[PDB]
Each structure stands twice: as C-alpha cells, then as structure tokens.
Amino acid sequence: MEVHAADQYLVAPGEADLLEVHARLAGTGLFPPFPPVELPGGVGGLVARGGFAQTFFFPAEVLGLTFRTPKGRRVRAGGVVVKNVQGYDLVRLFVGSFGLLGRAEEVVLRLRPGRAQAFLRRPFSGSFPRLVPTPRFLFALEDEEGPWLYAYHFGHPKEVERFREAFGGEEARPLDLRPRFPRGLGLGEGPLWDLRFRYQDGGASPPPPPAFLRLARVL
Amino acid sequence: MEVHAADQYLVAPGEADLLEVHARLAGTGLFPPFPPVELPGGVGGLVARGGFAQTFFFPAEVLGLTFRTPKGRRVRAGGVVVKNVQGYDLVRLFVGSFGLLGRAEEVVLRLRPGRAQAFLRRPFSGSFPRLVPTPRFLFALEDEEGPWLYAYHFGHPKEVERFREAFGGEEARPLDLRPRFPRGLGLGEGPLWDLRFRYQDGGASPPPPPAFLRLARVL
C-alpha cells in the first residue's frame, strides 16, 4: 500500500487488513477512517459495508477506488492525482453497496491528523451515550462478561486527554473479531453493533432497492 | 414545501426556487445547503448539479430524493431513518448526475442551525483564498465592474462575527442569476464559478464516465 503522508491519504488493495493498515500508519501521526479492529473482508469489505463504528459521514472519506464488477469489468471511480470534471459519483455508488457491485481491488482513503490517540472500553449501559468531545468511533461488543462500549479517538493531545476524562474506562488493545464472524460479518442480533447496524455471524446482507438491483446487472 | 423544523430537514418539490426556500426559512434559525442565490433549475437542478458554491461535501446534506427516470419510472431514495437498512446509496448516485438519470421531483435536505449569518463580497484577486474560519459557501461572479468574490456563512454569532472580520469586503444582498443564464446553467467560460465548476449560459453538461452511461439505460 502507499502512504501519502504529506497529502494525508492512503492507497491500498481491497484485500489489505484493517490492522495491517493501522500497523503501517504507526508513528506517522495519520489515522484511517476506521478503528483498530479487524473485521472480515479487510479494507475492501469495510468500504463495501459503508464503514464500521463511525460517528461521522464515512463515504466522504473514500476518495477513490477501483472495483471489479460481478461480470469481470474493471471500474475506476474518483481519484486524487487525476480526476475528470467531477459529478457522476461512482465512489459513493460503491460505498455501502455490500458486494452487490463486485469487490474493490484498490481503495483510496483520506487520512486524518492526530498528535494523540486513545482506544478505550467500559461497561455498556444499553444505549450509546452522547460524549463530549464526540469520539471518531464508537461501538458495542459483548465479551460474554457483559456488553462493552468501545470508543476510539484521535487528534490534539488536549482533545484526547479531554476524551479520556469524559469516557473513563480502560485502555484497550487492537481487536481481531474475525474469529467471531467465521461465516461473515452480516446483519442480525449479534454481539456487535454501531450507530448503523447490529452485526451477526452469517447474517444476511441488507436488501437492495429495486433500482440498485437493476443497475448492478449492467455495470 | 414542508419544513420539518424540529427534525431539521426540508421536503421540497424539485421545482422549488432557491430563494423561495430561503424566504420560507428566513427567521427560523435553520439554513439550507445553498447560499441566497437563485440559479436555473430550482432545488432539483441544484441537487442534480451536486450543489453550488459549497466548501464542504454537499452530497451528505441531501437526505433523500425522488426522481423520474428518462424511461418513466419513479424511484424514491434515502429518507432520514426508514428507507431500508442504510446501504445502496441511490441518493448520492443521483446527486451530481446532471439530469442524466432523470429529473428530481422531490428533494429532502438537511437544514443546519444558525443564530447569525453573513453574505459578503469583495474584489476577486484571481484565485480563491484559504479563509479562516472557512465560510460554508464561496464563489466568484463577474459584473460590469469586474470579478467579485462572494462568501456566505452562518452559525454561532461569534463565528460569523470573526468571519466578517477576516473576509472584510462589503455586505451583499440575495442574487437572482436566472436572467444571466436563460439557456440554463451549464459548464463553460462564463461569468460565474465556484470551487468545482465554471458556469456558462447554455453550456454543456459534463461528460459521464462509461459506468454511468451504462446504468443510465436501466433503472
């Protein structure tokens, strides 16, 4: 993969692992649009699902991508160094398409700056709290010891310190949840959930609207 | 149109004029995702072009929309909570499609709160400046006198005040540019331009990528 530190963006293969990306950004002061949590599908799958644990609008963090349609056609979308007169949003079309349009072979993601970072966890209480400052990522996970509210944030040491003081809990190390979703990260009443979905091992993919089913046949 | 003040969103027919939306919201403390400038096509046209004068990601400000395809079908997309399981972004697909996918019959836009606003202009220097704080909208327009840099911002009274301080210039009133673009707001070497396009009366529409031409045939 390619880390464009100065321009704050990353170029990586769809098959790149989420922790693989975090490992590569170690000490760079740059952060990807996802927490230190490994999930089935890697970067490509994450993009296809429209992100994980975000408290922000994820699609805008995807600057470009190249995907392979279920028919074998290569489609390039967006870009950084080269781009057409814009419009015709092929990037957002793919983001959140859950694999219906094929798999991402390459993804270009925006990276955000941060002098400090904190990945914390604390006992869950039913609903997601409104923290201040709002962490960039928030999600719940049941560890069999009860639910756990996880939060990941980065930015100025002052905002992060502020985050720690508002959240409390304990420091958490990078998680690898692939072992708990062997049949795939689908949707359902599973042990993991964020502001958008509740995930379940082998759960079904969300139902696409008629229009999407139609366009997917000709892409 | 229907103003859902408490939920901070607006439902408007595609033909609603940009200035009628502003008049409808004047005094509500809520602002639409466009400045006080009338442009050919109304809100539907604005959405089709992917926004006007924004310094932010415009597509995210569009929560839903209903369009009639060239073949006659009508497809309802998005809809803040309750549409489908957040995925398959038909909304962003339409935003910035320039009419290629059909006409917007209805648009659902997010409204942003603000206790103060400022619409100002100053002689354009030849390139867009990096302002601090950065205004929500910025564009350049030529008049008999010459090119003018226009900026529109809203939000916290102290934020807007600081903007007025850094930007300088003079107070500007709502503009109606339909008379200057009677043949439509297309692309070209015209008298109006923002961070994404340079507009021209009766100008051409941007060229769609192959993938877009393909799915346009269906849906």
| B144: Cβ contacts below 8 Å, ≥ 6 apart | none
How far does chain A reach from its first CA to its final CA, in angstroms? Answer: 27
Which residues in chain A have their CB less than 8 angstroms from residue B98's CB?
87-88
Select the residue of B96, B207, B214 nearest A89 (Cβ to Cβ).
B96
Distances (CA, A) of A71 to A67, A74, A103, A217, B19: 11, 9, 11, 9, 46
* Beta-carbon separation of A212 and B57 below 8 A: no
DSSP line for B193-212: EESS-EEEETPBPPPPPHHH
Calculated CA dihedral for residues B11, B14, B20, B24, nearest 10 degrees = 0
Select the residue of A92, A196, A208 nearest B59 (Cβ to Cβ).
A92
Buried b (16+ CB within 10 A) or exposed e, B195-205: ebbebbbebeb
- Method underlying the structure: X-ray
Q: How far apart are CA B95 and CA B46, in angstroms?
A: 9
- Phi, psi dihedrals of residue B127, rounded to the nearest 5°: -150, 155
Do the beta carbons of residue B22 and residue B13 sit within 8 Å? no
Select the residue of B57, B86, B206 nearest A50 (Cβ to Cβ).
B86
* Beta-carbon separation of B207 and A84 below 8 A: yes
How far does chain B reach from its first CA to its final CA, in angstroms? Answer: 27
Inform me whether the C-beta atom of residue A218 falls under 8 Å from chain B C-beta atoms. Answer: yes
Buried b (16+ CB within 10 A) or exposed e, A92-116: bbbbbbbbbbbbbbbbbbbbeebeb
Which residue is closest to A196 within chain B, CA to CA? Answer: B86
Which residue is closest to B89 within chain A, CA to CA? Answer: A93
Pairing state between β B175-176 and B37-38: parallel
* Beta-carbon separation of A89 and B207 below 8 A: no
Which residue is closest to A99 within chain B, CA to CA? Answer: B88
Which residue is closest to A216 within chain B, CA to CA? Answer: B215
What's the gap in Å between the CA of A14 and the closest CA on chain B? 19
What's the gap in Å between the CA of B163 and the closest CA on chain A? 24
Which residue is closest to B48 within chain A, CA to CA? Answer: A87
Which residues in chain A have their CB less than 8 angstroms from residue B187's CB?
85
Pick the CATH number of B1-114 from 3.30.465.10, 3.40.50.1700, 3.30.470.20, 3.20.20.20: 3.30.465.10
DSSP line for A21-60: HHHHTTTTTEE-SS-SEE-TTHHHHHHHHT-SSBSS-GGG
Give the 3-state secondary structure of residue B99.
coil
Domain extent listing, chain B: 1-114, 115-173, 174-219
Closest CA to A56 of A135, A151, A156: A135
* Beta-carbon separation of A206 and B87 below 8 A: yes
Interface of A with B in 91-130 (CB under 8 A): 92-93, 95-98, 100
Q: How far apart are CA A108 and CA A198, in angstroms?
A: 27
Inform me whether the C-beta atom of residue A52 falls under 8 Å from chain B C-beta atoms. Answer: no
Closest CA to A106 of A58, A65, A59: A65
- Phi, psi dihedrals of residue A168, rounded to the nearest 5°: 75, -130
Distances (CA, A) of B184 to B15, B51, B103: 14, 15, 15
DSSP line for B162-202: HHHHHH-SEE---EE-GGG-TT-EEEEEEEEEESS-EEEET
Q: How far apart are CA B102 and CA A203, in angstroms?
A: 35
Q: How far apart are CA B136 and CA B35, in angstroms?
A: 9
Mutation choice for A interface testing from B49, B55, B219 by most A CBs within 10 A:
B219
Select the residue of B59, B196, B209 nearest A88 (Cβ to Cβ).
B209
Give the sign of the dihedral formed by CA A6, CA A61, CA A183, CA B88. Answer: negative
| B109: Cβ contacts below 8 Å, ≥ 6 apart | B9, B10, B12, B32, B33, B43, B61, B62, B63
Decide yes or no: CATH 3.90.1150.10 for domain B115-173. no
* Beta-carbon separation of B86 and A217 below 8 A: no
Inform me whether the C-beta atom of residue B218 falls under 8 Å from chain A C-beta atoms. Answer: yes
Asked whether the domain spanning A115-173 has the same topology as the one spanning A1-114, the reply is: no
Select the residue of B59, B75, B87 nearest A96 (Cβ to Cβ).
B87
